[PDB]
Structure formats: C-alpha cells, structure tokens
C-alpha cells in the first residue's frame, strides 16, 4: 500500500543483503517464502502458500508477484519489527534516538538475528544511544556477529558509523563492474569456441583427426561459456545462488563435466601429436576414424562418471556444520566436498592429464635435439604447458590443501583460482587453432 522514501531505502538495503525473489521458493527449513524473506506458511502445500499470498497481495498471483508487491510484504515485516522494538525495554531507548538511516541498520540486525538476539548487544546499544559512533563500530567489529557474517556486518556497521548508505552504494558499484567484466569473459569463451566449431564443420580440409579432437575441446569449452561461467558469475555479483537446490546440483555437475572433458582432451591432443610426429607412418596405420572418435566418447564417458554419477548420488557430501548448513540453504551452492571425492576427482580431472602432458611434450623435444647437432617449437611447448599450468594448477593445489586443512584456503582465493581455470576455455582456441588453414578459415568466416 503506502510507500515512503525511507521505506524504499530499507527495501533496497536488504535486497542487497538478502536478495529478492518474485516467485515462491523454499527457505533453509523448507517453508514457502516470497519477496525478501517473507514467510507465507509453514504448510507443505504450494496451493496453501498461494492462497496466503493472494490474500496478502490482493490479486491472483499464482506464485508470481511484482517488485511493488514485494515491497508491500516487506514494509509489513518492517512495521512488525519496529512494533516489537518499541515493546522491548532494551531496544526502545536506542531506536527512539537514532536517525532514519541508523534505524535501518538496527532493523537490519533484527532481520538477521531476531529481536531478542539484537537486544543482547547492551554495550553497543548504549554507545549508539549516546551517539558514540566510532566506539560502537569498534565494539561491534569484535562481535560474534561480525566473525560469522563479515561482509554483511561490515556494511551494517559502516551504516551505523557514518549514518550514510555508502556501504550499500559501494556494493552496487562493485557488482556492476564485475558484471561487465565477467560478461566480457563469457563472450570471449563463446565466440572463440563457436568460431572454431563451425570452421571445422564447413571447411572440408579441416576434418583431420587431430582437429577431430580439437572440436571436442572447443565444444567442452563452449558449454562452459554458455552454462557454467554465466551461472558461476551470478554467485560473485550477488553473493548467493538464486536458482534453487536442484539447478545448483545440476550446474555443479555440468561444471565438473566440461572441465574434465576439456582437460582430458588436452591430454589426448598431447599424445596424438607425439604419436604423429615421432612415428608418423605407424600413426595413420594405428588411428582410424573409429578409434579417434572412440577416444573422445571415452573422455566424455569418464567425464560423466566423474561429474553426474557421484554428484547426483551425493557421494561427494561432507558431514560437518558448514557442509550441512549449505546443503539445507538453497541460496548456498558451495561445493563442500569430502576428502576422497576432492582427491579422486582432482586426480582424474587434472593430475593424471598434467603429468601425461608433461611427459609427452617433454619426450617430444629431447628427441628434437637428438638430431639438430628449434626454439620456435620450444616456446610453443613453453606456453602449451605454461598456460595450462598457470590456469589450473593454482586451483587444484588449493583444492587438495583445503581437503586436509579447511582454514588455509579462504573462499575468495579459492573462487579466484577457479576463475583462472575458467579462463583457459577462452585461451585454448587461441592456442590450439593457429594452423594456416585455421587462420585462413577464420578470415573467411567473418568476411
């Protein structure tokens, strides 16, 4: 119904901190919810949730509401929270003395920990009631609250300290930049790989068997540009998974699929060349068209058994508190695995291809200077392994360290290393498609 400028600022405050959903969803304990955390019912009936929603909105929503309708529900929750604050002898004196911006910070805390929870901050509250902003900020920065949710606590505390919305303005700008940056990464992956796939598809002289292996690489790198990297970017710019527990588990398995198919194909290409460059005449008398396709179908078969089988069977799940907290939270899509899956998948996806590629490309060049007595072939070796190593080894070292000592690998670092590997899907078409009949092919496609 009736909205205000103060009303709307609190709304946009918590859309950043908690998120907005215009369709009915489930909360951490399975209850139907909509808007910004508005509980519809505890009943295990979607139609029951819809009737409660329709009575509250005043329209036949069928589970789908608008933003303005979400603010109607939200301002009712704010009204209720304020109404209980004034009934609380611990919170009413502080609330009565605060300006509108800092009242929003206090309401934000109540939405996160409950009225009773926030009323336990008696010393911070005394300091806020006396307008001792910097002392209250220091004190709040030592809280259990701060150590549990550092990012949200920093934004709320900044709001208390300054009485401005600067923390939330800085978040919107940060995300918007990462949105453009990752949107660029997405299309470099897509364009570079869709350009390779059709160049093979329509040019008759590019159907070699070494290029038969390359378009399996480019197609594994293409699914990642279309499905894995985009939905991976929503987690970074929003701090949450927005697409439900089921798509979390499907997205996760598609991620480990494409990366397993991609890296193992780099391994097949690695030995393919060797087998073709050291003994070319045996090579053709050994690798038929069926055998070449036999390898790629095996790679994708191995990749499926590393990705969809164990993840859908829940063979990967850890058994700790943050493991179970994330499994119950449909907004958390962290890949909290156990030690055996973390190690087994890393060996199949990355470690055995790394050391096979390291061995193959090494024997290529020792048997090169066995006849010269050049480095334009060494520097090609240098980057084929150099780019592949810098993109994926930082992540799988951190992956195995985290699998033994969780506290050593912070999430930020862990997510950055994974994005280094994501960038390899854009680097590979640049690396493995530089033949004169690739170069002359791409020119023909875009002219």
């Amino acid at each position: 119904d009736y909205k205000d400028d103060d009303d709307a600022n609190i709304f946009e405050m918590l859309r950043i901190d908690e998120g907005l959903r215009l369709k009915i969803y489930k909360d951490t304990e399975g209850y139907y919810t909509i808007g910004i955390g508005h509980l519809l019912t505890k009943s295990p009936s979607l139609n029951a949730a819809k009737s409660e929603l329709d009575k509250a909105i005043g329209r036949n929503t069928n589970g789908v509401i608008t933003k303005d309708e979400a603010e109607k529900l939200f301002n009712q929750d704010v009204d209720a929270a304020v109404r209980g604050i004034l009934r609380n002898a611990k919170l009413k004196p502080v609330y009565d003395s605060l300006d509108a911006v800092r009242r929003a910070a206090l309401i934000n805390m109540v939405f996160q920990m409950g009225e009773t929870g926030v009323a336990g901050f008696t010393n911070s509250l005394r300091m806020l009631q006396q307008k001792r902003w910097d002392e209250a900020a220091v004190n709040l920065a030592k809280s259990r609250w701060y150590n549990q949710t550092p990012n949200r606590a920093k934004r709320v505390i900044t709001t208390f300290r300054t009485g401005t919305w600067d923390a939330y303005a800085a978040s919107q700008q940060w995300t918007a930049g990462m949105g453009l940056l990752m949107a660029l990464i997405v299309l470099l992956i897509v364009a570079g790989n869709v350009l390779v796939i059709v160049a093979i598809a329509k040019t008759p002289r590019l159907q070699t068997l070494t290029n038969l292996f390359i378009m399996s690489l480019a197609s594994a790198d293409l699914v990642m540009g279309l499905l894995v990297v985009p939905f991976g970017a929503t987690i970074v710019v929003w701090g949450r998974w927005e697409y439900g527990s089921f798509f979390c588990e499907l997205w996760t398995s598609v991620d480990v699929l494409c990366v397993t198919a991609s890296i193992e194909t780099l391994c097949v290409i690695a030995l393919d060349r060797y087998l073709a460059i050291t003994s070319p005449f045996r090579y053709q008398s050994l690798l038929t068209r069926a055998r070449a396709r036999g390898l790629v179908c095996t790679v994708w078969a191995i990749s499926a058994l590393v990705s969809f089988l164990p993840i859908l069977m829940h063979w990967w799940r850890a058994e700790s508190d943050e493991a179970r907290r994330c499994y119950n939270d449909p907004k958390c899509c962290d890949f909290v695995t156990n030690r055996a899956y973390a190690i087994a998948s890393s060996v199949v996806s990355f470690y055995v291809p790394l050391c096979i590629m390291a061995f193959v490309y090494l024997r290529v060049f020792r048997e090169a200077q066995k006849q010269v007595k050049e480095q334009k072939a060494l520097k090609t070796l240098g980057i084929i392994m150099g780019v592949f190593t810098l993109c994926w080894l930082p992540f799988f070292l951190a992956n195995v360290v985290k699998a033994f000592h969780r506290e050593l690998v912070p999430d930020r670092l862990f997510v950055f290393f994974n994005w280094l590997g994501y960038a390899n899907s854009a680097f590979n078409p640049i690396i493995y498609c530089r033949s004169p009949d690739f170069r002359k092919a791409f020119q023909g496609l875009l002219c």
Epitope: E367, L381, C433, S435
Partner: nanobody
Framework: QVQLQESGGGLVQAGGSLRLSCAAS????????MGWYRQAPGKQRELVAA???????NYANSVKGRFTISRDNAANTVYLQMNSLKPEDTAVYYC??????????????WGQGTQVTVSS
C-alpha cells in the same frame, strides 16, 4: 626463408635408372618428413616414397622396392632411386617436406617440380 631445390629428372627408356636430389635450403625443425609426390595428366597427385628424420620410411604400392628413398643426415637432403622404370611412371615429381615446428599442425614446403617421362 626456406625453399626446396630439386633435380635429377629427364627422359629415359623403359627399365631405366635415375637418382633424385632435393636440398632443403635454410634451417627448419628437426622432426620432419621428406618425401616425393607425382601427378600424371588426367590422374591426380599421389605419394610415392617418404622418409622420417628418425628413419621410418613408407613406399607406395606401385613400388616393389624398385624405388628406395633415403635421407642424408647433417644435410637437409633426400634422394630417391628410380629403377626398373615402366611407362606408367610419366609424371612431374615434387619434393615435399613436413615441418613440425608448430606442434599442433603440419607446415608444408613444396618444390616446384621436375618433369620425368619414360619411353617403352
């Protein structure tokens, strides 16, 4: 920066002998394949004999050892001995080298050709 220089052609009667010489001027990568290709009018291009820098060779099936290809290490030069020649061998012969400096794909240098015609 690297060109193939080829010699040894001409005309000979049936059951004759020639030795071909192909010098690969300039420096190129150490793993490679030197070989020979021919194409008669009407027919289309065809391998006859190739040799790898390690030593592995491969002859066509129009050659029952009558032709023997061989390199000469320390020199980018491959030779092809043509013995027991039949009138079916009239074709322009081409010297080819498979360069492997780029590791993902082949690089092909071509000699321009030497005519070979045989009479019965």
């Amino acid at each position: 920066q690297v060109q193939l220089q080829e010699s040894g052609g001409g005309l000979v009667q049936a059951g004759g002998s020639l030795r071909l010489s192909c010098a690969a001027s300039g420096s190129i990568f150490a793993l490679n394949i030197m070989g020979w290709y021919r194409q008669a009018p009407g027919k289309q291009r065809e391998l006859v004999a190739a040799i790898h820098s390690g030593g592995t060779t491969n002859y066509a099936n129009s050659v029952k050892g009558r032709f023997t290809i061989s390199r000469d290490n320390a020199a980018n030069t491959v030779y092809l001995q043509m013995n027991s020649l039949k009138p079916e061998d009239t074709a322009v012969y081409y010297c080819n080298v498979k360069d492997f400096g780029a590791i993902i794909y082949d690089y092909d240098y071509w000699g321009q050709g030497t005519q070979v015609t045989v009479s019965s």
